[PDB]
Amino acid sequence: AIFRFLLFFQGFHNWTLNPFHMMGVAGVLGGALLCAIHGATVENTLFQDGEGASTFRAFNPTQAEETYSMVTANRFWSQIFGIAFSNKRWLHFFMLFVPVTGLWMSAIGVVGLALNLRSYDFISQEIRAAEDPEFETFYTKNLLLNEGIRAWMAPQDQPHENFVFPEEVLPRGNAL
Amino acid sequence: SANLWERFCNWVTSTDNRLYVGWFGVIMIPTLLAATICFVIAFIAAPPVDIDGIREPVSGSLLYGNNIITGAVVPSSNAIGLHFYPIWEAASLDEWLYNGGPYQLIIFHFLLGASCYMGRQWELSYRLGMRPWICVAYSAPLASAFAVFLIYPIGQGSFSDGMPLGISGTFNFMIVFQAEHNILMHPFHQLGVAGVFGGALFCAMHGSLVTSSLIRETTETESANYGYKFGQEEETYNIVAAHGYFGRLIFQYASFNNSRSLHFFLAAWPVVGVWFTALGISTMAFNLNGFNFNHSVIDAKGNVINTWADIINRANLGMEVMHERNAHNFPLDLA
Amino acid sequence: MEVNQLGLIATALFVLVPSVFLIILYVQTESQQK
Amino acid sequence: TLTYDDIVGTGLANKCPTLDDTARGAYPIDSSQTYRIARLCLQPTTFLVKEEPKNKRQEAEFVPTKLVTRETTSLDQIQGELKVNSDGSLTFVEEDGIDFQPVTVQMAGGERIPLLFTVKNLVASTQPNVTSITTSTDFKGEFNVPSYRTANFLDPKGRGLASGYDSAIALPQAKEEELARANVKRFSLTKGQISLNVAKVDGRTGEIAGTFESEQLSDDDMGAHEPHEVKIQGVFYASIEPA
Amino acid sequence: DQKLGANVGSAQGPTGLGKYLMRSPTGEIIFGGETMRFWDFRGPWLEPLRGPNGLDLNKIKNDIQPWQERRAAEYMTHAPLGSLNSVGGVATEINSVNFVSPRSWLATSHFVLAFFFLVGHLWHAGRARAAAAGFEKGIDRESEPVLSMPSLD
Amino acid sequence: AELTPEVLTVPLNSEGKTITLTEKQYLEGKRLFQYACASCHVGGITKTNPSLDLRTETLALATPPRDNIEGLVDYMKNPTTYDGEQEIAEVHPSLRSADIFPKMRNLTEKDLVAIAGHILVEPKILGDKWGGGKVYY
Amino acid sequence: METITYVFIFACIIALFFFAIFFREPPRIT
Amino acid sequence: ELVNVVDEKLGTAYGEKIDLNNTNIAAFIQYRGLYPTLAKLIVKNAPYESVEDVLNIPGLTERQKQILRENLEHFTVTEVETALVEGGDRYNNGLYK
Amino acid sequence: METLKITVYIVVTFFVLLFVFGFLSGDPARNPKRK
Amino acid sequence: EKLAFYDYIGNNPAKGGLFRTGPMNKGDGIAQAWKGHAVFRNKEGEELFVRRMPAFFESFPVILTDKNGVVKADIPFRRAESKYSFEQQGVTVSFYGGELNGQTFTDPPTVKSYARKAIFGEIFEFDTETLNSDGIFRTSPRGWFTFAHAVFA
Numbered sequence A: 001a002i003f004r005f006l007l008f009f010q011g012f013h014n015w016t017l018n019p020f021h022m023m024g025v026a027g028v029l030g031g032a033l034l035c036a037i038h039g040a041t042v043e044n045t046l047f048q049d050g051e052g053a054s055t056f057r058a059f060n061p062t063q064a065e066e067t068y069s070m071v072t073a074n075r076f077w078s079q080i081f082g083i084a085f086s087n088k089r090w091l092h093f094f095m096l097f098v099p100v101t102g103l104w105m106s107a108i109g110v111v112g113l114a115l116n117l118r119s120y121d122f123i124s125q126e127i128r129a130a131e132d133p134e135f136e137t138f139y140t141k142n143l144l145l146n147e148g149i150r151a152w153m154a155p156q157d158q159p160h161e162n163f164v165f166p167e168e169v170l171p172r173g174n175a176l
Numbered sequence B: 001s002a003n004l005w006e007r008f009c010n011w012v013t014s015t016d017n018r019l020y021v022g023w024f025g026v027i028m029i030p031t032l033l034a035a036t037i038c039f040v041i042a043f044i045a046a047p048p049v050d051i052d053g054i055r056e057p058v059s060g061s062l063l064y065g066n067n068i069i070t071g072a073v074v075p076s077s078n079a080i081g082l083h084f085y086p087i088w089e090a091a092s093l094d095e096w097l098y099n100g101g102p103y104q105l106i107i108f109h110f111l112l113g114a115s116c117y118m119g120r121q122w123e124l125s126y127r128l129g130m131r132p133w134i135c136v137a138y139s140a141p142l143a144s145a146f147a148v149f150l151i152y153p154i155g156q157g158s159f160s161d162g163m164p165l166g167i168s169g170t171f172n173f174m175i176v177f178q179a180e181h182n183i184l185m186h187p188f189h190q191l192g193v194a195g196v197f198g199g200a201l202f203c204a205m206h207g208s209l210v211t212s213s214l215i216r217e218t219t220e221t222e223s224a225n226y227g228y229k230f231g232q233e234e235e236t237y238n239i240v241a242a243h244g245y246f247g248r249l250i251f252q253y254a255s256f257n258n259s260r261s262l263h264f265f266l267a268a269w270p271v272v273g274v275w276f277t278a279l280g281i282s283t284m285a286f287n288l289n290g291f292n293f294n295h296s297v298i299d300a301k302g303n304v305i306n307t308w309a310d311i312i313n314r315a316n317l318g319m320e321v322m323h324e325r326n327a328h329n330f331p332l333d334l335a
Numbered sequence C: 001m002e003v004n005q006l007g008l009i010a011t012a013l014f015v016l017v018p019s020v021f022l023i024i025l026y027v028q029t030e031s032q033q034k
Numbered sequence D: 001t002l003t004y005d006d007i008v009g010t011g012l013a014n015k016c017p018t019l020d021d022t023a024r025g026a027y028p029i030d031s032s033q034t035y036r037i038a039r040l041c042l043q044p045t046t047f048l049v050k051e052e053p054k055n056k057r058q059e060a061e062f063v064p065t066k067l068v069t070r071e072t073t074s075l076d077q078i079q080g081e082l083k084v085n086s087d088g089s090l091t092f093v094e095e096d097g098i099d100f101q102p103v104t105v106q107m108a109g110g111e112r113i114p115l116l117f118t119v120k121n122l123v124a125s126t127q128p129n130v131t132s133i134t135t136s137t138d139f140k141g142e143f144n145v146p147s148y149r150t151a152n153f154l155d156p157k158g159r160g161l162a163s164g165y166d167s168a169i170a171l172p173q174a175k176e177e178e179l180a181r182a183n184v185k186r187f188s189l190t191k192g193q194i195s196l197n198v199a200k201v202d203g204r205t206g207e208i209a210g211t212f213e214s215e216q217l218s219d220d221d222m223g224a225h226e227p228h229e230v231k232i233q234g235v236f237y238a239s240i241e242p243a
Numbered sequence E: 001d002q003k004l005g006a007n008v009g010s011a012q013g014p015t016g017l018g019k020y021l022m023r024s025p026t027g028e029i030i031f032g033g034e035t036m037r038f039w040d041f042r043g044p045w046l047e048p049l050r051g052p053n054g055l056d057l058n059k060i061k062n063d064i065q066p067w068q069e070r071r072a073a074e075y076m077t078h079a080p081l082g083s084l085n086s087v088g089g090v091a092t093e094i095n096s097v098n099f100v101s102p103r104s105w106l107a108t109s110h111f112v113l114a115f116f117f118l119v120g121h122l123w124h125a126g127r128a129r130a131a132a133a134g135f136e137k138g139i140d141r142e143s144e145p146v147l148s149m150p151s152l153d
Numbered sequence F: 001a002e003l004t005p006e007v008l009t010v011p012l013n014s015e016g017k018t019i020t021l022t023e024k025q026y027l028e029g030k031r032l033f034q035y036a037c038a039s040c041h042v043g044g045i046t047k048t049n050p051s052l053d054l055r056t057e058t059l060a061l062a063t064p065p066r067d068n069i070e071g072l073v074d075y076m077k078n079p080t081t082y083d084g085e086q087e088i089a090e091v092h093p094s095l096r097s098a099d100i101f102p103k104m105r106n107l108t109e110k111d112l113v114a115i116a117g118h119i120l121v122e123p124k125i126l127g128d129k130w131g132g133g134k135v136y137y
Numbered sequence G: 001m002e003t004i005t006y007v008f009i010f011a012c013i014i015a016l017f018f019f020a021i022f023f024r025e026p027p028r029i030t
Numbered sequence H: 001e002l003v004n005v006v007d008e009k010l011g012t013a014y015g016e017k018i019d020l021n022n023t024n025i026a027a028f029i030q031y032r033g034l035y036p037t038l039a040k041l042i043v044k045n046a047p048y049e050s051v052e053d054v055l056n057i058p059g060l061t062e063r064q065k066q067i068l069r070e071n072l073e074h075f076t077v078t079e080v081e082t083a084l085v086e087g088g089d090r091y092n093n094g095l096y097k
Numbered sequence I: 001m002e003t004l005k006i007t008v009y010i011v012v013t014f015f016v017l018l019f020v021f022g023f024l025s026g027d028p029a030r031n032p033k034r035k
Numbered sequence J: 001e002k003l004a005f006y007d008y009i010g011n012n013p014a015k016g017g018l019f020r021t022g023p024m025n026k027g028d029g030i031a032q033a034w035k036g037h038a039v040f041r042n043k044e045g046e047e048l049f050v051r052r053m054p055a056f057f058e059s060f061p062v063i064l065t066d067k068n069g070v071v072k073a074d075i076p077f078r079r080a081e082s083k084y085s086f087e088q089q090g091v092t093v094s095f096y097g098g099e100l101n102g103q104t105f106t107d108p109p110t111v112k113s114y115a116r117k118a119i120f121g122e123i124f125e126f127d128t129e130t131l132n133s134d135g136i137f138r139t140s141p142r143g144w145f146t147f148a149h150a151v152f153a
């Protein structure tokens, strides 16, 4: 019942093309990166505080020294990515920021979809597509996918509208 | 000269280079410069590509009417399928740009380099005396590019079915995928979103817990960040106060107190979840799709009682029935 | 093509203005003695 | 003879057969014995696209163009009866075969010029009184050039002739007179000229060879813009047999 | 359609490419439609129709045998498309034909296994190299290698 | 809202006489229909030739009439074209060709009657769905 | 005009990249 | 002026009855015993100048001629339209279920 | 065009050799301690 | 006129887009006059009705039904088997009150044009020149104020 909410938004609001939804994902996707990346950076940049292989027990629940080489981590990334943290206070605040900002943006985009004030089309594109029949972008392509979603779904998805779309009116490509 | 080659190997491998050009790097640096340089030119000036092999060019570059959001580098022709299409396989560049040659030059060099990029994430860790495995975290996002840029095409029989290199072009890959595979209804994708949602979630948890339990060493009107010096001996936050709060939010045994176990979980979760998402695309590349509950619940007479699973099928049919307008000549979509 | 006339200036000031902001600060920070 | 595998990938498959320098003979025509063409074949070598003077009329010369698609140009398996006529001439009449191939060539500017290189419904003829087919025994005639794209083809915005949208649905309240031409699809049908002039005969097996030159129009894109004039030069191979 | 009186050789499809037969990039005659991507398929049932230039319009025109017609029909209706819960067909299909090609099962199971094993490789190889040189349990608090290297800054 | 005997009572022969199936035959047919038909006739259509469906009306205008137990049964033994002017047992499963379509070997006259009954009963329950394709899914 | 604007910003981000990697504030210890 | 020949054809006999010169072959499946054999002959045997000219297809067995006579009321005939006949569209116009 | 193929080929060989003859050069050796 | 004007989907704040800038006039154009009420009928004299466009839909199909809601006519996508084309039904359109008052139109294209318009409610006459409109709906101040305050809040 949530997947149709997704499909709906594509089909009717062309939500994937919305600047705010994009920021949304950049944050959630980018947030799930910091998560993974920071975790691994820590586990493979640890000091030896035990004689075992399973280094989990080797941890001081009672502070004291940093359990992983923040100095080594810095040099690693500074040589493989070119950029690297060097202020755990910032590295951790950043981790709060990225995914919380992302979700905030994805919200605004929807607050706009309430009024249907969507980010459906690019006018310059539509105008050229009207006059010139050979102009085709991955954008125009998508809009057609939407037409199909709307036409074939609307009927059983909005019962209160007693929709009746004769077979001949249903948009369809060749053969399919 | 202690011996040129002996020296060369000492430089390459040198851990004193601003950027660690490694052994894997010797393959990476060039392949990645080609991929990048070809892309940027393509995306800006490449001409229309007959992606579907039906002589119906799709222009996806800026200079040919696209903007950042719509523009993309279009996949090689379907007329080409899985055949290798190196520039030296075309009567001319004009022919090569029309059949989507740039696409292959890019995906192959990128995938090649992005792998070595992994090989490097190991090497440097070795030359520095740190434990490996970071490169194993990066195996997830890589294993995805692979699934989306190569496995899926191999499986489907053509590179023209690989994900395009552009914003909208990607949404296309998604919307159609869903129609042909009903991915949202597949265990692997779900595990994928759990990992991504979860990741972002946890990323926020850690991030906040820690940042909120920092030991005071800063002024009231001074960036709380300065309270940390690069190359500190002791910790910069009270991981015992952190655990104290979080243990009370939910309940003690449901909270981490071992920074090492915390960080393993922090890495394990997203990487494991994305691994499954990548295996999903690599699996639905052989047509083992999501659950098909169409017309499952039926009543006492035989009538079909719809579920949300059915409302999903209609939305899928719309996509099926409209994608690739002119490419089909027969009843079943087996390609 | 058939784009918006103000699009150019909207993008220009959208980049300039805040960039000019940061820059004014960074340089005035950077030049503070000791 | 070579098997499929002996040709696959060589491009050899898109080449009409050839006769050797020897075979420059002459085939006899019984005029009382029906004959047919077991296999006509046309291989393009060049595609020239007549240019336009613009306002200032200065004549328009055909210009070479690059073949942007690949080796998919050849017409093969053409077949029909080669009836002998009262005046002793011969007229070929095609029935069926791979009689058309969609070709696309680029130009100076970078413009892609798609055409439906064909010879559908060919009606080639020769000189009156032609007892035996000698080297250079001109065949000339017309054929039909159907619309490049067929009735069902839909443009990037869904509009089509036999199917598809009625208008620019992306611009719900726009004036329509201006968009007229691009919303209303028209199906073009035209005539073409070709001449198959022999160069190699071989009365022995009754298989002649040569070169052709044909002219036709290119795609007008469901009538959205004007078609370009095209000239096509190549070679052909025909298999004449009593039958 | 050929039985309905259609001339497969000259049939023109929506795009102007050839409803039933078209040419591959190197000139050979192949089946048309999205199936142009599989022109590399060879098979007992289909070979007898192939000529030295690919599908021969004469054999296709009168040498097609019934066992082939039903072979093509069988295989057409048993393509390797199906769902996790084993519902043969396209994702939009209806329940009834419970089937998922053995070729799909095998191929997926083994790509997963094949994959995870490549991770297994990376993991056990990464461990072995640190184990050998000897640091797979942490950086020596005392002798921290990085700390003896010049600053690149 | 149930499959009563009524919904099961379908035309037996051309001369109006009818027969009434039982919930056992029905299910049994439905199972057999899946075993030897769905492959190509899933949901009343025909994948290897979409022009001819199993809609009762389509079977009514068939030649001979195939819209009754007797009809469909004959068909499953000696199949013909829509005008009946040609036997197709060679490329269509049937009893006279079980050597070529093994799935048809087990099949006994009892089974053929059920399959036939299913075809006439389905549209009675599903209606338009049975004939049409994805449009109705 | 649009193309120019898109490429410019891109060119500006790459410039940033450069300066960020090669002209950062050297990261000092203790 | 510009017009969609097909949408215009639907305002004539074609659009009300099986057009022997345009309508696609599958249309014959809506009447008893016309499909396979006869529909092929009708379509295969080019255009007709009047519905009855169908009764004149060479070879038609006496029974076929009978059937044809019966269904003539369901046929008509109009100018051959290229958009509808080209591409062999009368044997397969890209429509299935 | 047949040239470019040659060149490309040469170029890729160089790097691929540089790569194999690289790890071959006693790579285990290169690292902080035990070697 | 004023009353008829409110019965036009082009004044529905729910139509529009986030980057579809400007007044409502840059869209459909400056409203000039009410063409009049359009009544559609088919050969039998039966009066048909145009199914209106729900705000949710960017594009919507032209479907015509009688009082009881039975589909009597429509504008087909695939003509191959259309049963209700305006052509096959002799659909006609007549106007009452307004610019087109007292007039009737019967040539398919013109009838369909107006049918295509009926979808948005009362048919009007716009001046698209002046503002160089593009014919793509934009939202009213009511709409913008609402979006802005819901976000700020």
Ligand SMILES: CCCCCCCCCCCCCCCCCC(=O)OC[C@H](CO[C@@H]1O[C@H](COC2O[C@H](CO)[C@H](O)[C@H](O)[C@H]2O)[C@H](O)[C@H](O)[C@H]1O)OC(=O)CCCCCCCCCCCCCCCCC
Residues within 6 Å of the ligand: B187, B190, B191, B194, B195, B268, B269, B270, B272, B273, B292, B293, B296, E084, E085, E086, E087, E088, E094, E095, E096, E097, E098, E099, F034
């Ligand atoms: C970072 C940490 C990461 C940790 C990661 C952990 C990963 C753990 C993975 C664990 C398990 C993977 C399981 C794969 C299962 C595949 C099951 C399946 O193929 O099953 C097939 C069956 C069959 O279903 C039946 O399918 C049937 C019919 O098929 C057919 O039958 C018909 C006749 O009956 C006809 O013949 C027809 O043609 C034919 O196709 C009928 O329709 C039935 O009505 C229908 O019930 O499955 C059913 O019933 C299924 C009911 C399923 C509920 C499934 C939930 C699955 C996953 C939930 C995941 C939640 C994750 C949250 C994660 C949070 C954080 C990570």
Ligand code: CLA
Residues within 6 Å of the ligand: A005, A006, A007, A009, A010, A011, A015, A016, A021, A024, A025, A026, A028, A029, A102, A103, A106, A107, A108, A109, A110, B174, B196, B197
């Ligand atoms: C490819 C990557 C991608 C990514 C990263 C995202 C990311 C996101 N999307 Mg998209 N989306 C995509 C692709 C993507 N999307 C595509 C292709 C489509 C189709 C076009 C959509 C369509 C879409 C829609 C329609 C929506 C999103 C929304 C969102 C955001 C949701 C926020 C969230 O996590 O819920 C937040 C969840 C909560 C607050 C609930 C938390 C409840 C907690 C407190 C307790 C649970 C406890 C419970 C009691 C325990 C027991 C449970 C029981 C089941 C066992 C998020 C930023 C949503 C959005 O924009 O929101 C503003 C939205 O509506 N997306």
Ligand code: CLA
Residues within 6 Å of the ligand: A002, A005, A006, B189, B190, B191, B193, B194, B195, B197, B198, B201
């Ligand atoms: C508003 C509430 C809401 C809620 C509760 C959910 C909840 C869920 N969504 Mg959903 N979603 C929402 C809004 C919401 N969504 C919106 C607005 C959108 C966009 C339109 C989506 C889009 C979306 C997608 C695309 C997917 C989901 C999925 C899921 C499930 C993910 C599990 C996970 O890893 O989460 C992170 C959470 C955890 C790791 C913690 C587990 C919490 C729960 C399960 C248990 C708590 C247990 C108990 C209370 C505590 C222990 C007590 C002790 C005594 C035993 C989950 C049930 C996925 C799915 O279907 O998976 C099968 C999926 O693919 N959602």
Ligand code: CLA
Residues within 6 Å of the ligand: A101, A105, J018, J019, J020, J021, J022, J023, J138, J140, J141, J144, J145, J146, J148
């Ligand atoms: C507070 C509410 C408010 C509202 C509802 C409006 C509404 C309107 N204005 Mg005004 N306006 C306002 C405040 C407001 N204005 C102010 C303060 C000024 C002076 C600066 C103006 C100056 C003004 C002019 C000069 C004109 C209008 C016009 C219009 C109408 C334009 C129609 C349109 O397409 O909008 C377009 C709406 C948008 C583009 C909003 C999108 C904002 C997005 C792009 C960016 C958010 C940026 C941020 C960086 C995102 C993420 C950040 C990250 C850190 C998280 C519309 C009725 C036009 C008119 O009256 O025509 C007849 C006109 O010419 N307005």
Ligand SMILES: C=Cc1c(C)c2cc3nc(c4c5[nH]c(cc6nc(cc1[nH]2)C(C)=C6CC)c(C)c5C(=O)[C@@H]4C(=O)OC)[C@@H](CCC(=O)OC/C=C(\C)CCC[C@@H](C)CCC[C@H](C)CCCC(C)C)[C@@H]3C
Residues within 6 Å of the ligand: A029, A030, A032, A033, A036, A037, A040, A080, A081, B032, B033, B035, B036, B037, B039, B106, B107, B110, B114, B117, B121, B137, B138, B140, B141, B164, B165, B166, B167, B196, B270, B271, B274
């Ligand atoms: C889709 C969202 C997503 C993106 C975009 C993304 C991106 C990135 N992740 C990286 C790293 C990582 N990501 C990680 C975990 C994760 N990453 C995730 C999700 C993402 N990660 C998730 C969910 C996880 C958790 C499992 C890890 C653990 C790492 C790393 O270690 C690595 C890193 O170094 O981070 C610091 C970076 C590797 C850069 C590189 O080697 O460039 C190579 C090329 C460069 C720099 C420039 C040349 C560009 C040329 C080759 C491009 C040619 C064109 C492309 C092939 C086309 C693609 C573009 C599309 C728009 C079509 C890169 C910025």
Ligand SMILES: CC(C)=CCC/C(C)=C/CC/C(C)=C/CC/C(C)=C/CC/C(C)=C/CC/C(C)=C/CC/C(C)=C/CC/C(C)=C/CC/C(C)=C/CC1=CC(=O)C(C)=C(C)C1=O
Residues within 6 Å of the ligand: A022, A023, A024, A026, A027, A030, A031, A033, A034, A037, A038, A039, A041, A042, A070, A073, A074, A077, A081, A083, A084, A085, A086, A087, A091, A097, A098, A099, A101, A102, B039, B040, B043, B044, B068, B166, G006, G007, G010
């Ligand atoms: C002319 C031409 C070719 C033009 C264009 C070509 C083209 C296709 C361009 C595409 C680009 C494009 C338009 C993208 C659109 C997306 C976009 C710009 C969105 C912008 C708006 C947006 C998302 C705003 C807010 C949301 C948000 C916070 C997103 C955050 C994303 C983000 C930065 C994620 C992090 C990714 C990442 C690599 C983090 C690394 C962190 C760090 C280096 C780890 C190293 C490290 C780890 C440790 O653990 C420790 C301990 C230390 C010490 C340490 O160092």
Ligand SMILES: [Ca+2]
Residues within 6 Å of the ligand: D111
């Ligand atoms: Ca020109």
Ligand SMILES: [Fe+2]
Residues within 6 Å of the ligand: A038, A042, B206, B210
């Ligand atoms: Fe941390």
